[PDB]
């Protein structure tokens, strides 16, 4: 992986039987890119100096055998703006007995997780928290939410934490407006948001 | 833990368990010519011209300022300094300790 | 389609704006902290120090200017907020239900920070009835805040300032007493330096402190005064005016220090000292980056603090309208701060920019020296040279932590129990560290 | 047209150029974390860059053509 | 000549019968040679033309700030002329226009810091003294207007240099009338200098003078109004010569005192307000059955302000002020006021706000059954606002039996149209509710008795007020009676009077929103078709009414009725979207959805006649395609769109243009098929095609927006951008727009880089087209171009390198 | 002739006919409005205190903005009065 000031990242394969450098696949999209952490054979992690997560992979048409800069590519599948800069990305598990969690520290002194799901049912759910939180609850200092994350990018396949773990917060009548909206009672929602930190980071309840 | 100058990256010892941090700044003068900086200004205080009847020196070789707390002679454009140290992380104290050339920094 | 869910677990600790006042309406005093994007606010304690930490908000957006005012005879500070998007906020504080209550917003300019787009810099007036609102571009917009007899704000029209290719360094208000308010700033021209093929204007260009004027009456927005100064300017203390002291600005610049009223008032300059054996390249001057107007019903003293922790007691000297002496004094030496706030019964918020933040106990007031006061009115070609010098002044009461700025993390198991502990290598210069990070109950 | 930025069928590179010099640095003023970046990379405060910032405004690309 | 400079200023009559460009240029004419030009013929014409009565609005908007634009200037060439000014706009500020008022404010305001003050005070000097309340009348409002130009302390010493001058009660009390039309004038930003103009104004308050008497205190109250609500301790000498004057003086000045105090204390502490208040009370008590009208305001208000202060003890109120307060101030003479109607309204209910409800209610419970019409109106208005204030939480047994008594008692005598009943009854159940167990069948009992007669316009009230008590019929577990006038309504659908018409239908859709749908007394399939003749009429409350009464059946009991009754109902309610009313509209689309969930897709088809508007169908279309889902009705217009002719093709590229508007993003799954649809559609054949597909590619890429698709849009996109060459102005501004929906979805940065190609190129044709597309896209979102600008390497002589993105740490 | 004012915006709220009730203002449609509209307080005076804002007739109803040109951020602009000239 080869992480190139102005490109993305560029993948190199080398041939042991003829000491060969070979560039095989690259991008189309220039990112300021500082740092990285790998999680599998074909998805790079990366970063940017702006605040640009992101997320490619290799499509398993690409040949491994092989001899703008490639007309074979790699796909996105993440773009989610923070607003601060990230600076070291390691996939690990915080918690013992637990599952995997790309952790994201910042410049600003912070630190972030990452999470993968379980099902189209639960992603879904919480989409249409998203789709009613976000008009039916403004931001504080009126940015226009999906036009911040959408800042440079097309934002690309994220959930927002933060946004939706407002209903810790947001008025009772609005709880009854939200939670009747979708009808579901206000302790299996705040129960439903126990889950998550309870399961990956965290959070120290016990049942 | 106490360091030095700016940590720029720093990797895990497998074997024995231990750390190696390298440390790096723009804008620096090190020890070596911190101190013999110190000594050619004393010398020349001693060239101002006049009773050379009483000296400065015997206060002005004693204390060091903590660079912790009374800030830092920053100087230069092209100015550099390097310092690489290993550490253990059960109790405090520090291993080895290796300094650098002055124009010539470690990343 | 692998989707993802952000989530955080340690809100980040970097001060950038501190401004203070009376939020909870009461005689007691809050310090608005703010971060990239949340909003918090403190409050210290008045018996043992520890900063009992109240509210904190998200705002998902950029904070870039964050200026407190009290209307006439109010009793509760409001904070107004600029924002990314050209949109200006107001809020409010509410002890019982505990958050901030918006009051109103003015749609002016597109998104995003633009050239010609304001809400890069917003002037208050120190009557809290003007503010005004200021791009690097030829936008600027002054608003009025009336308050009806329904205990609202009642805000007014945008007011129009257009005026092709000037930059701004910096604007803030002039405490005028009781007119047509008036508004400073340090412009610079350039469409002298937009012909020329040699590009000599380049150079021979300078600053003129330019004056602004609101007509109440007419609803109009003219200029008062427009005078060139020497050199490049930095930020711009208000002098505290009205009754109490003169009306002016004291301009900090490269080495020297500058008042300069308005009319017929002769510039003192006084340059600013060097310590005692420096150990550094003569070619660097030395600036400010902070400012601290402590203002008492009696009189009033600055603390300013210079690059290398130097924090400067200026006693200003002046006549009626007229001004006399800037006499300068330092205070002692602190780790620098990038902004900083001084509390009722003596209590000093050094709020550093990198690393730890401070809170200091002033012990003891006036000015009880040996070492020698500076001036003005002293012939000198030389300049001031002065002791560093050790605490003398001020006591640490406590340290507030912080993280920033996280250089370098790793996750890893290095004892011998289950949970992996986070080493991170950050830190700032000579007081940079090295942190060992759990994750248990406060032992 | 009268919005500052517009090109039209005269242009040419230099103005063009300078005027993407001359957003970048207001977009660098803009950010809140940047200068935190370019304080920490090379070292100084942030009034110092700040300063450079507003002082390399007018300057830079030197004199047009001819 | 300067008859020649009036010759030239015919361009006044270019600037007011103008263009833009006139009017801007012309003005730019003018007002570039004001100084230039001159004083004498300026005022010469403007002056008459100004004087001329059948001036407009927006034409003297024009000549008054054409007055302002060239007074930019002119400083000192006005000090002979203010006098003559001045005397010409005598009036115009005292008139009877608000408009009129503001624009003299405007133009003396801009005269007043154009000329000097000490001018404005010697040239109006003379007007102090005249004989002539009119002139001392326009004069004092006229230094206030210059007062609010130049300021508060640039006058103090003229104020202080008048007010303790002793040579004319005419001048002293224009001194007054002054600080008085400042304070109205003003208003606001009088608070700091506040303390100061009690020490100007203060000793006109123990001078031989009723007239200064009566202007001062006046005065007095006319600040203290703004400075309203504080508390503030710059009123410390007003209190004792008015203190003094209460029981020293009786008259006019009273009112003049007692508005003062009243206006005084909104805002005085508790203790002071205390101890005042009890000290004013005595002689109020004294002064309540004082007849005047003037009298009872002065003395009403003064009750609703000392009753303001919340430091005032409700046993104080309830058991001392309100016993004479309602034994004294209640006539039914108090009918044809409708000052002391409502001013005895709203101070009686600032009162109940405080003290309660139950007390203010029982005391006129007795008086409610009275012969007199605008006095039972008077106290049905009270009992109404102080029920929907407080409620019934404090009204009570051996109270309420009167009062259903009284409330039915009352309500069986009533003729004419009053609100206050319907309103007011319906106010009170809405406090009622449950709690009234043992009265029903009396209450809607006499509903019937009100329901069988009197040329409907009872029925009409009666109606309304089912219809606003039709919640309590649901929580009441009574259910026979409301099926028994429901089957009597049932009875009652046929009427030419269609205002009454729509309260009996939306008293039967308030009863069907509320009635079990299970073991409905009416049959439904005999109510719905002799509900359909309806909704062929003319009226908007019918109309709406009945649709709505259709949306609420099919949102309830959809178990019942036959699909040939809902088709008929579908194709009956096609043509009412063509309305004009929004309401129509919005109910036609709301309950045209329900249906449609009755029926469905499947049944309804698309070619419905070669004719005209059809844009209800198009609508219908768009609603049947959202309220199931299109997975039916977009291979349907495929099918629809795969015929080769002329005609149709457009007219299908509409409704995926209404389509993809009305769904957006949960036709996000349903994209794939339209794009070769749209390949066939894209290519190139025709305006229509280009302009309004191009349209389909902007809506779409709206709905689209942060939902996971791109590279279809993508290749859309590179089928959309060589179009871009076409001369016809509708269709490049589409080719623009539909840029401007490319740039949003698919991002900042492909946009430019199928921009930046022939940037340079050498031929001006094509410059003009990149250029262009250049600029649209700048002014969109130029903060986002900061990362995705291509870096360019140096040259020679200057820089091109941002460094600033090549640090490393 | 018709052709927007573009000028800036106070607190001025616009009105509209009931006959031309249901647009928005720019691109003409009709599709979710959630949008308040300001307008300049110049063209605000007058014999123009209640006014449809397009065809010029006695005002009943505000207007809004289309969440169409929100997300497309034309909004921000000047005052968005046609204008006969
Ligand atoms: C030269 C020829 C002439 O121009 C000729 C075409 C002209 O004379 C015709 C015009 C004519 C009569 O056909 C106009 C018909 C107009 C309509 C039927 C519009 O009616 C309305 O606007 C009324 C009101 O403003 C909006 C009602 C409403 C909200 O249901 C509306 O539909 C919507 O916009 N929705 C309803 C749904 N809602 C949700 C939010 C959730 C998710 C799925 C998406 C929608 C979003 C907003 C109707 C628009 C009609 C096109
Ligand atoms: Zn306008
Ligand atoms: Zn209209
Ligand atoms: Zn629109």
């Given at each position: 992986?080869?992480?190139?000031?102005?490109?993305?990242?560029?993948?190199?394969?080398?041939?042991?039987?003829?000491?060969?450098?070979?560039?095989?696949?690259?991008?189309?999209?220039?990112?300021?890119?500082?740092?990285?952490?790998?999680?599998?054979y074909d998805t790079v992690a990366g970063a940017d100096k702006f605040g640009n997560i992101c997320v490619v992979r290799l499509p398993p048409n690409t040949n491994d055998e092989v001899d703008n800069g490639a007309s074979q590519k790699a796909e996105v599948i993440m773009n989610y703006h923070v607003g601060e800069t990230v600076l070291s990305l390691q996939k690990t598990t915080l918690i013992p007995g637990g599952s995997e969690s790309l952790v994201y520290t910042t410049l600003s002194g912070?630190?972030?997780?990452?999470?993968?799901?379980?099902?189209?049912?639960?992603?879904?759910?919480?989409?249409?928290?998203?789709?009613?939180?976000?008009?039916?609850?403004?931001?504080?200092?009126?940015?226009?939410?999906?036009?911040?994350r959408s800042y440079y990018f097309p934002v690309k396949n994220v959930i927002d934490g933060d946004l939706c773990e407002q209903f810790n917060s947001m008025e009772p009548n609005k709880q009854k407006n939200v939670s009747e909206e979708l009808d579901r009672t206000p302790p299996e929602v705040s129960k439903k948001l126990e889950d998550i930190r309870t399961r990956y980071a965290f959070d120290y309840k016990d049942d | 833990f106490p360091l030095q100058y700016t940590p720029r990256k720093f990797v895990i010892h497998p074997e024995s368990n231990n750390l190696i941090i390298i440390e790096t700044d723009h804008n620096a003068y090190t020890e070596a010519t911190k101190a013999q900086r110190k000594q050619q200004m004393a010398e020349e205080m001693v060239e101002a011209a006049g009773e050379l009847a009483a000296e400065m020196a015997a206060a002005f070789l004693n204390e060091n300022l903590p660079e912790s707390i009374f800030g830092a002679p920053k100087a230069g454009n092209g100015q550099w300094a390097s310092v690489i140290r290993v550490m253990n992380p059960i109790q405090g104290n520090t291993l080895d300790l290796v300094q650098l050339e002055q124009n010539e920094a470690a990343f | 389609d692998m989707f993802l869910y952000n989530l955080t677990l340690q809100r980040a600790t970097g001060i950038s704006f501190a401004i203070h006042g009376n939020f909870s309406g009461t005689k007691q005093q809050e310090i608005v902290v703010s971060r990239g994007k949340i909003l918090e606010l403190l409050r210290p304690d008045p018996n043992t120090g520890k900063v009992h930490t109240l509210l904190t908000v998200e705002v998902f957006g950029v904070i870039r200017s964050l200026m407190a005012f009290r209307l006439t005879g109010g009793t509760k500070d409001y904070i107004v907020v600029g924002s990314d998007s050209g949109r200006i906020v107001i809020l409010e504080y509410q002890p019982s239900?505990?958050?901030?209550?918006?009051?109103?917003?003015?749609?002016?300019?597109?998104?995003?920070?633009?050239?010609?787009?304001?809400?890069?810099?917003?002037?208050?007036?120190?009557?809290?009835?003007?503010?005004?609102?200021?791009?690097?571009?030829?936008?600027?917009?002054?608003?009025?805040?009336?308050?009806?007899?329904?205990?609202?704000?009642?805000?007014?029209?945008?007011?129009?300032?257009?005026?092709?290719?000037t930059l701004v360094y910096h604007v803030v208000g002039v405490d005028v007493g009781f007119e047509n308010p008036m508004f400073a700033c340090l412009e610079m021209d350039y469409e002298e330096a937009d012909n020329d093929p040699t590009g000599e204007a380049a150079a021979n260009t300078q600053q003129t402190l330019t004056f602004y004027e609101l007509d109440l009456g007419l609803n109009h927005v003219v200029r008062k005064y427009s005078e060139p100064l020497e050199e490049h300017g930095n930020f711009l203390i208000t002098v505290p005016g009205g009754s109490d002291g003169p009306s002016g600005v004291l301009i900090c610049s490269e080495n020297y220090i500058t008042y300069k009223n308005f009319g017929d008032q002769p510039?003192?300059?006084?340059?600013?000292?060097?310590?005692?054996?420096?150990?550094?390249?003569?070619?660097?001057?030395?600036?400010?980056?902070?400012?601290?107007?402590?203002?008492?019903?009696?009189?009033?003293?600055?603390?300013?603090?210079?690059?290398?922790?130097?924090?400067?007691?200026?006693?200003?000297?002046?006549?009626?309208?007229?001004?006399?002496?800037?006499?300068?004094?330092?205070?002692?030496?602190?780790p620098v701060a990038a902004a900083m706030c001084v509390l009722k019964t003596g209590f000093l918020f050094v709020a550093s920019e990198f690393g730890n933040h401070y809170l200091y106990q002033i012990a003891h007031l006036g000015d009880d020296d040996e070492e020698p006061e500076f001036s003005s009115a002293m012939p000198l070609e030389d300049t001031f040279f002065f002791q560093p010098r050790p605490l003398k002044n001020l006591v640490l009461v406590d340290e507030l932590d912080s993280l920033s700025p996280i250089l370098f993390c790793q996750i890893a198991d290095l004892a011998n129990e289950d949970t992996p502990q986070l080493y991170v290598a950050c830190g700032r210069g000579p007081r940079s560290s090295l942190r060992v990070l759990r994750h248990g109950l406060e032992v | 047209s009268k919005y500052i930025g517009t090109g039209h069928a005269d242009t040419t590179k230099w103005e063009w150029l300078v005027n993407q010099h001359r957003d970048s640095y207001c977009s660098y003023m803009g950010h809140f974390d940047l200068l935190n970046y370019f304080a920490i990379a090379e070292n100084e405060s942030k009034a110092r860059v700040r300063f450079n910032l507003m002082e390399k405004m007018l300057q830079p690309c030197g004199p047009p053509a001819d | 000549e300067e008859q020649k400079e009036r010759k030239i200023m015919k361009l006044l009559l270019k600037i007011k019968n103008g263009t833009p460009p006139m009017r801007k240029a012309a003005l730019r004419q003018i007002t570039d040679k004001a100084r230039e030009f001159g004083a004498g013929p300026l005022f010469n014409q403007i002056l008459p033309l100004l004087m001329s009565p059948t001036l407009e609005d927006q034409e003297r908007h024009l000549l008054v700030k054409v007055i302002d634009r060239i007074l930019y200037k002119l400083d000192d060439l006005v000090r002979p002329y203010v006098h003559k000014i001045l005397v010409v706009i005598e009036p115009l500020l005292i008139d009877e226009d608000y408009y009129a008022r503001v624009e003299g404010r405007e133009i003396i305001s801009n005269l007043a810091k154009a000329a000097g003050l000490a001018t404005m005070i010697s040239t109006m000097r003379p007007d102090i003294d005249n004989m002539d309340e009119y002139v001392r009348n326009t004069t004092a409002r006229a230094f206030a207007v210059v007062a609010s130009a130049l300021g508060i302390p640039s006058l103090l010493p003229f104020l202080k240099a008048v007010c303790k001058s002793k040579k004319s009660w005419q001048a002293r009390h224009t001194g007054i009338k002054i600080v008085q039309q400042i304070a109205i004038l003003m208003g606001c930003a009088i608070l700091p200098h506040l303390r100061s103009l009690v020490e100007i104004i203060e000793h006109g308050l123990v001078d031989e003078q009723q007239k200064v008497r009566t202007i001062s205190a006046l005065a007095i109250a006319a600040?203290?109004?703004?400075?309203?609500?504080?508390?503030?301790?710059?009123?410390?000498?007003?209190?004792?010569?008015?203190?003094?004057?209460?029981?020293?003086?009786?008259?006019?000045?009273?009112?003049?005192?007692?508005?003062?105090?009243?206006?005084?204390?909104?805002?005085?502490?508790?203790?002071?307000?205390?101890?005042?208040?009890?000290?004013?009370?005595?002689?109020?008590?004294?002064?309540?059955?004082?007849?005047?009208?003037?009298?009872?305001?002065?003395?009403?208000?003064?009750?609703?302000?000392?009753?303001?202060?919340?430091?005032?003890?409700?046993?104080?109120?309830?058991?001392?002020?309100?016993?004479?307060?309602?034994?004294?101030?209640?006539?039914?003479?108090?009918?044809?006021?409708?000052?002391?109607?409502?001013?005895?309204?709203?101070?009686?209910?600032?009162?109940?706000?405080?003290?309660?409800?139950?007390?203010?209610?029982?005391?006129?419970?007795?008086?409610?059954?009275?012969?007199?019409?605008?006095?039972?109106?008077?106290?049905?208005?009270?009992?109404?606002?102080?029920?929907?204030?407080?409620?019934?939480?404090?009204?009570?047994?051996?109270?309420?039996?009167?009062?259903?008594?009284?409330?039915?008692?009352?309500?069986?005598?009533?003729?004419?149209?009053?609100?206050?009943?319907?309103?007011?009854?319906?106010?009170?159940?809405?406090?009622?509710?449950?709690?009234?167990?043992?009265?029903?069948?009396?209450?809607?009992?006499?509903?019937?008795?009100?329901?069988?007669?009197?040329?409907?316009?009872?029925?009409?009230?009666?109606?309304?007020?089912?219809?606003?008590?039709?919640?309590?019929m649901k929580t009441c577990q009574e259910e026979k009676l409301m099926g028994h006038l429901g089957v009597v309504l049932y009875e009652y659908l046929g009427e030419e009077y269609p205002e009454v018409l729509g309260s009996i239908l939306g008293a039967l859709k308030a009863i069907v929103n509320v009635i079990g749908m299970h073991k409905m007394t009416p049959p439904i399939k005999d109510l719905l078709p002799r509900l359909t003749p309806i909704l062929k009429n003319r009226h908007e409350k019918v109309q709406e009414n009945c649709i709505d009464l259709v949306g609420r059946i099919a949102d309830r009991g959809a178990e019942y009725v036959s699909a040939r009754e809902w088709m008929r109902i579908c194709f009956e309610l096609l043509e009412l979207l063509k309305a004009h009313k929004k309401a129509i509209r919005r109910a036609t689309v709301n309950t045209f959805g329900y249906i449609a969930k009755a029926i469905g897709p499947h049944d309804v088809l698309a070619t419905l006649l070669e004719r005209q508007n059809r844009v209800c169908t198009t609508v219908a279309i768009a609603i049947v395609a959202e309220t199931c889902s299109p997975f039916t009705v977009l291979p349907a217009l495929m099918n629809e769109y795969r015929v080769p002719e002329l005609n149709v093709q457009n007219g299908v590229l509409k409704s995926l243009s209404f389509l993809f508007e009305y769904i957006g993003e949960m036709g996000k799954d349903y994209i794939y098929a339209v794009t070769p649809l749209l390949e066939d559609a894209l290519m190139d054949r025709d305006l229509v095609h280009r302009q309004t597909a191009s349209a389909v590619v902007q809506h779409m890429s709206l709905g689209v927006y942060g939902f996971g698709c791109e590279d279809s849009l993508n290749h859309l996109l590179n089928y959309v951008w060589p179009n871009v060459f076409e001369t016809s102005p509708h269709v490049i501004q589409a080719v623009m727009g539909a840029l401007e929906g490319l740039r949003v979805a698919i991002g900042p940065c492909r946009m430019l880089q199928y921009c930046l190609q022939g940037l340079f190129h050498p031929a001006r044709k094509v410059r003009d087209v990149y250029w262009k597309i250049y600029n649209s896209i700048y002014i969109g979102s130029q903060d986002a171009l900061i990362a995705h600008y291509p870096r360019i390497y140096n040259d020679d002589k200057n820089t091109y390198i941002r460094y600033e993105l090549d640090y490393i740490l | 002739d018709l052709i927007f004012c573009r000028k800036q915006a106070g607190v001025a709220i616009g009105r509209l006919c009931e006959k031309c009730d249901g647009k928005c203002v720019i691109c003409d449609s009709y599709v979710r409005p959630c949008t308040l509209v300001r307008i300049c307080d110049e063209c605000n005076y007058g014999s123009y205190q209640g006014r449809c804002v397009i065809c010029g007739g006695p005002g009943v109803s505000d207007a809004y903005y289309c969440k169409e040109c929100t997300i497309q951020e034309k909004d921000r602009d000047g005052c968005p009065k046609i204008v006969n000239l």
């Open positions: 992986i080869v992480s190139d000031v102005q490109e993305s990242f560029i993948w190199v394969r080398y041939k042991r039987n003829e000491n060969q450098l070979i560039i095989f696949a690259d991008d189309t999209y220039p990112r300021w890119v500082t740092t990285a952490s790998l999680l599998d912070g630190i972030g997780i990452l999470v993968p799901f379980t099902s189209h049912e639960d992603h879904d759910f919480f989409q249409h928290v998203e789709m009613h939180l976000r008009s039916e609850h403004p931001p504080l200092c009126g940015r226009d939410h999906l036009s911040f | - | 239900k505990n958050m901030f209550e918006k009051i109103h917003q003015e749609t002016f300019g597109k998104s995003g920070c633009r050239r010609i787009v304001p809400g890069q810099f917003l002037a208050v007036d120190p009557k809290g009835r003007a503010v005004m609102i200021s791009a690097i571009e030829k936008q600027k917009l002054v608003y009025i805040l009336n308050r009806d007899a329904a205990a609202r704000l009642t805000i007014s029209s945008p007011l129009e300032a257009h005026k092709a290719n510039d003192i300059r006084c340059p600013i000292p060097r310590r005692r054996n420096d150990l550094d390249d003569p070619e660097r001057g030395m600036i400010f980056v902070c400012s601290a107007t402590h203002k008492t019903k009696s009189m009033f003293f600055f603390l300013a603090q210079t690059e290398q922790g130097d924090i400067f007691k200026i006693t200003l000297e002046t006549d009626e309208d007229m001004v006399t002496e800037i006499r300068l004094k330092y205070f002692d030496t602190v | - | 600040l203290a109004e703004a400075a309203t609500p504080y508390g503030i301790e710059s009123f410390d000498s007003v209190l004792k010569p008015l203190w003094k004057g209460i029981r020293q003086h009786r008259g006019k000045g009273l009112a003049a005192f007692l508005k003062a105090i009243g206006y005084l204390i909104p805002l005085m502490d508790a203790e002071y307000a205390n101890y005042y208040t009890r000290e004013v009370m005595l002689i109020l008590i004294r002064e309540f059955q004082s007849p005047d009208e003037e009298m009872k305001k002065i003395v009403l208000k003064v009750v609703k302000q000392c009753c303001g202060t919340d430091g005032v003890e409700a046993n104080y109120i309830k058991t001392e002020i309100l016993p004479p307060f309602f034994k004294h101030f209640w006539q039914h003479r108090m009918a044809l006021d409708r000052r002391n109607y409502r001013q005895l309204v709203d101070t009686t209910v600032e009162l109940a706000n405080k003290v309660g409800a139950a007390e203010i209610i029982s005391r006129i419970v007795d008086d409610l059954k009275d012969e007199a019409e605008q006095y039972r109106k008077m106290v049905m208005e009270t009992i109404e606002k102080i029920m929907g204030n407080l409620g019934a939480a404090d009204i009570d047994h051996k109270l309420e039996e009167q009062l259903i008594d009284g409330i039915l008692y009352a309500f069986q005598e009533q003729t004419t149209e009053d609100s206050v009943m319907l309103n007011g009854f319906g106010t009170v159940v809405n406090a009622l509710g449950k709690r009234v167990k043992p009265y029903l069948p009396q209450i809607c009992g006499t509903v019937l008795w009100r329901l069988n007669n009197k040329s409907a316009k009872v029925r009409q009230q009666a109606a309304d007020l089912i219809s606003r008590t039709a919640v309590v | -």
